Amino acid sequence: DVPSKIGTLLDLSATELEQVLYFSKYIVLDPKGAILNGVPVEKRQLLTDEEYRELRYGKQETYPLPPGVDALVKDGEEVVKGQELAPGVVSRLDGVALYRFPRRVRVEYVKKERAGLRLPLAAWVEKEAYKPGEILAELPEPYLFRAEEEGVVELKELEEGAFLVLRREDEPVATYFLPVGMTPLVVHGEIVEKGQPLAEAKGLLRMPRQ
Amino acid sequence: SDPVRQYLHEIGQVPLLTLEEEVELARKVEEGMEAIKKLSEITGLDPDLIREVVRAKILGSARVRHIPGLKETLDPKTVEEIDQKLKSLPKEHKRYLHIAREGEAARQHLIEANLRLVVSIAKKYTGRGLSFLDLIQEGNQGLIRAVEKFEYKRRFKFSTYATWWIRQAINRAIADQARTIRIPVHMVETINKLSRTARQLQQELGREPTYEEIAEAMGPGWDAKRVEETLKIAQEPVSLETPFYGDFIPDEHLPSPVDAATQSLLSEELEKALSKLSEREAMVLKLRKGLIDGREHTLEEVGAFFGVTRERIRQIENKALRKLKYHESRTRKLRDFL
Amino acid sequence: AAIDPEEEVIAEAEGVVHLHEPASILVVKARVYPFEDDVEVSTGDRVAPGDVLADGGKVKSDVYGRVEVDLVRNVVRVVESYDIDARMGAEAIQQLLKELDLEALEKELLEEMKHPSRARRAKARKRLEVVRAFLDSGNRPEWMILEAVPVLPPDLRPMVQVDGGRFATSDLNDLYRRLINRNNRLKKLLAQGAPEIIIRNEKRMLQEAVDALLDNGRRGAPVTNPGSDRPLRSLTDILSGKQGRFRQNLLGKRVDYSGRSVI
DNA sequence: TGCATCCGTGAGTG
DNA sequence: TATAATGGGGGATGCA
RNA sequence: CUCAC
Ligand SMILES: Nc1ncnc2c1ncn2[C@@H]1O[C@H](COP(=O)(O)OP(=O)(O)OP(=O)(O)O)[C@@H](O)[C@H]1O
Numbered sequence: 039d040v041p042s043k044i045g046t047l048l049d050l051s052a053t054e055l056e057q058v059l060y061f062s063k064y065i066v067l068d069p070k071g072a073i074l075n076g077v078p079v080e081k082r083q084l085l086t087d088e089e090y091r092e093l094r095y096g097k098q099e100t101y102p103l104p105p106g107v108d109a110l111v112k113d114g115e116e117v118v119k120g121q122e123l124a125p126g127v128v129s130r131l132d133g134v135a136l137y138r139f140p141r142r143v144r145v146e147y148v149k150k151e152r153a154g155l156r157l158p159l160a161a162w163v164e165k166e167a168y169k170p171g172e173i174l175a176e177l178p179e180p181y182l183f184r185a186e187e188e189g190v191v192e193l194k195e196l197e198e199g200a201f202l203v204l205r206r207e208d209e210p211v212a213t214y215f216l217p218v219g220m221t222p223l224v225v226h227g228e229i230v231e232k233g234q235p236l237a238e239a240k241g242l243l244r245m246p247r248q
Numbered sequence: 249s250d251p252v253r254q255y256l257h258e259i260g261q262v263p264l265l266t267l268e269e270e271v272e273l274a275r276k277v278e279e280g281m282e283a284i285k286k287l288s289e290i291t292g293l294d295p296d297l298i299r300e301v302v303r304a305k306i307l308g309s310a311r312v313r314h315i316p317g318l319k320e321t322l323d324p325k326t327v328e329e330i331d332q333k334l335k336s337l338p339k340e341h342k343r344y345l346h347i348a349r350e351g352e353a354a355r356q357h358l359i360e361a362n363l364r365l366v367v368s369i370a371k372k373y374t375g376r377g378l379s380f381l382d383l384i385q386e387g388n389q390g391l392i393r394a395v396e397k398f399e400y401k402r403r404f405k406f407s408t409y410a411t412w413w414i415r416q417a418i419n420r421a422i423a424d425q426a427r428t429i430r431i432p433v434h435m436v437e438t439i440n441k442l443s444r445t446a447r448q449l450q451q452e453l454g455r456e457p458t459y460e461e462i463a464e465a466m467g468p469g470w471d472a473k474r475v476e477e478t479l480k481i482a483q484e485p486v487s488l489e490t491p492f493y494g495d496f497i498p499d500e501h502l503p504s505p506v507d508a509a510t511q512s513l514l515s516e517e518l519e520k521a522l523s524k525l526s527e528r529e530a531m532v533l534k535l536r537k538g539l540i541d542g543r544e545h546t547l548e549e550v551g552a553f554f555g556v557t558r559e560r561i562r563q564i565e566n567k568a569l570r571k572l573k574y575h576e577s578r579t580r581k582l583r584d585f586l
Numbered sequence: 587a588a589i590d591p592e593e594e595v596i597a598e599a600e601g602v603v604h605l606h607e608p609a610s611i612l613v614v615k616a617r618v619y620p621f622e623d624d625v626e627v628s629t630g631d632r633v634a635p636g637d638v639l640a641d642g643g644k645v646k647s648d649v650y651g652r653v654e655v656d657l658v659r660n661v662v663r664v665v666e667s668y669d670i671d672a673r674m675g676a677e678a679i680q681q682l683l684k685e686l687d688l689e690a691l692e693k694e695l696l697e698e699m700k701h702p703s704r705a706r707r708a709k710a711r712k713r714l715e716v717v718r719a720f721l722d723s724g725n726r727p728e729w730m731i732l733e734a735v736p737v738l739p740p741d742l743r744p745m746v747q748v749d750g751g752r753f754a755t756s757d758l759n760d761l762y763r764r765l766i767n768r769n770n771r772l773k774k775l776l777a778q779g780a781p782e783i784i785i786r787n788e789k790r791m792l793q794e795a796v797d798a799l800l801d802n803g804r805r806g807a808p809v810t811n812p813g814s815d816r817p818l819r820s821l822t823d824i825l826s827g828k829q830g831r832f833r834q835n836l837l838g839k840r841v842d843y844s845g846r847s848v849i
Numbered sequence: 850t851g852c853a854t855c856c857g858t859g860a861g862t863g
Numbered sequence: 864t865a866t867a868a869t870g871g872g873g874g875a876t877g878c879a
Numbered sequence: 880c881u882c883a884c
Pocket residue numbers: 491880
């Protein structure tokens with residue numbers, strides 16, 4: 039009934055009353071220290087749906103990643119606005135990033151073994167321990183690592199560098215380590231005797247990175 | 249200003265679930281259900297009450313009411329007591345609470361993310377007696393029913409299973425609310441069967457069917473009479489304000505002045521007979537004819553008000569009438585009173 | 587884990603876990619808070635800065651937020667959000683009309699009546715006319731909001747059986763049914779804990795029902811019976827108009843002891 | 850400039 | 864109760 | 880739609 043008695047009683051427009059009554063805009067009864075777009079929420083202010091979800095439930099955004107394409111960032115990492123998340127995906131805000139569904143789970147299995155390695159005396163540097171990437175020995179000339187046992191070869195390579203397991207029956211008799219700079223001369227499932235070269239070391243050899 | 253468009257816009261805000269997210273939410277819901285099922289075992293309380301409290305804390309403080317079915321009245325005080333009794337559990341017992349909260353919170357998003365289906369389902373049930381938004385607000389209840397019954401282990405997408413409950417909600421709502429005269433669902437189904445049958449008969453004959461053709465095409469137990477009666481009870485009442493239609497309709501209930509007159513002249517010319525008779529004579533007649541209680545008391549019951557048996561009462565009655573019959577033809581008042 | 591016992595990824599031995607190729611990346615504007623011992627807050631709770639989160643009160647919150655407990659990563663999240671109270675419908679309006687102290691508004695409006703600029707005096711005058719109307723009457727503004735809706739007696743909107751055994755009813759009956767079918771539906775949707783969209787839509791439809799019962803066709807479109815473009819006769823259409831109760835049944839009736847003939 | 854509200858009486862027929 | 868289905872179909876006057 | 884103004 040123009041002019042709206044209720045509307046004129048609360049300094050509310052016809053549009054405003056239409057929005058509040060018929061569920062088009064939220065009207066605030068208690069800000070509780072809230073702030074929208076820089077300004078603190080004042081009572082009797084008209085919030086929309088987005089303005090209400092942002093203030094009441096916070097803001098967030100899920101970005102689709104192409105099937106197969108991995109993410110540049112990792113899980114639990116803080117992100118800035120405009121910061122890249124994937125080779126083609128850019129984030130539109132700041133905050134904590136979360137991996138939705140990791141299609142591939144890679145498990146780095148911890149292994150602790152014991153292996154032997156023969157090297158010329160003047161060619162090896164004496165250390166009680168060896169960090170990854172650190173030079174284990176420097177050979178002035180091509181030296182061939184030779185088998186000290188006889189049996190079948192179990193070859194087990196890594197990302198860089200490799201192992202070697204000599205065994206009779208299925209019981210292991212020898213475990214040799216071939217660092218970065220030691221090229222194997224045998225294959226998997228090969229019969230070797232005592233004395234024959236299993237690998238060649240040339241130049242500087244060091245521990246692998248892993 | 250348009251509820252339809254407004255609701256369509258409000259529905260286009262919640263994104264569509266990926267298969268992974270779908271299975272995630274469903275799984276979380278089921279896990280929540282089981283978690284509450286064990287929490288009730290731990291606390292030794294009531295599953296419905298517990299899940300209702302979890303719902304309460306999940307939705308916030310905006311929604312707090314006593315739920316029909318729960319024994320305790322859900323006020324913030326009580327839910328505070330219960331929530332404090334939920335925080336009073338060991339780490340391996342208090343860990344099911346988080347699963348309950350997760351279950352409800354995932355249930356909400358699951359319902360919200362599958363609301364666009366109800367629209368596309370109820371879009372074709374239009375013009376049945378209920379409006380678009382009513383069919384939507386019933387199909388939504390059907391969806392709510394579909395959530396608490398879904399089993400993700402069966403590898404079926406939630407759409408396939410929800411569709412059933414949505415249709416089941418709509419087709420019930422229409423059959424329960426569309427008529428001014430509410431008809432039991434099965435009867436409505438019968439009437440619909442009549443409609444489709446008669447429609448087929450009309451389509452093949454080249455003319456409209458009779459009651460007999462319908463009754464024949466319906467099967468055994470069906471005769472023309474039952475078809476006619478079924479069509480009689482299937483009638484939809486019409487409006488009085490139809491261009492009014494209710495202005496050409498008399499008021500049969502209330503007595504007119506002519507009616508009120510004679511009824512007030514019948515009682516008058518009758519208590520002229522409570523006189524000429526006596527006090528007890530003009531009372532055996534009142535019980536017998538039902539002037540006092542409205543019901544006719546036999547000469548059996550009547551005997552227990554004067555002591556007399558069923559044959560002094562009879563002579564008590566016939567003395568009244570026969571005397572009243574002689575009081576007639578001398579006053580001759582009651583003749584026309586027909 | 588998986589559907590069946592098979593296909594399950596079981597750790598062969600000791601090692602660490604890494605995740606690659608995510609389906610998507612959920613960027614949340616929140617604050618993380620890891621824990622060692624039992625957590626005191628459950629997920630979904632509202633939290634202010636400096637509230638006892640987990641580990642017996644050691645780790646806490648920095649900002650206003652919503653609690654999101656992660657048991658997989660074993661971390662309590664806080665999504666930056668306030669406990670703001672903003673409502674809708676004729677409930678918030680009822681509250682705002684209840685919060686009114688008409689005396690104070692009379693004071694204020696009287697204090698603004700001294701300002702020039704033409705229009706201010708006028709608006710203050712009208713508003714103060716409404717305020718003083720409520721003050722003198724003794725009526726409360728919140729009564730402009732309906733909790734309990736009155737129901738007209740049956741005979742004044744009768745369902746009667748006509749001459750041919752058919753039934754004829756008033757238009758108020760279908761409106762009342764339209765009201766109840768949404769009120770009860772709302773009462774079911776509330777008890778069963780429905781999402782906000784559904785409840786909002788239901789309340790909106792309820793309002794659409796009371797605004798069709800009292801004055802059909804006033805706002806938006808008039809509700810019609812299926813199969814006709816005829817608006818149902820509301821309680822406003824009954825009283826007002828040339829066909830209204832006033833001009834048709836109070837200021838001029840049909841009478842007994844009256845005949846008509848060609849002169 | 851948009852919206853809401855008014856726009857003569859009694860009577861007959863289907 | 865479980866293929867999957869996910870966004871509709873004139874005519875003038877008073878008053879804000 | 881018709882009668883009277
Ligand atoms: N009383 C009547 N008797 C016969 N035909 C009528 C009558 N009223 C209307 N009609 C028919 O309807 C046509 C015009 O009707 P119109 O729509 O102008 O009346 P209406 O709008 O129904 O009147 P109201 O709104 O007062 O009921 C007439 O030309 C005539 O054919």
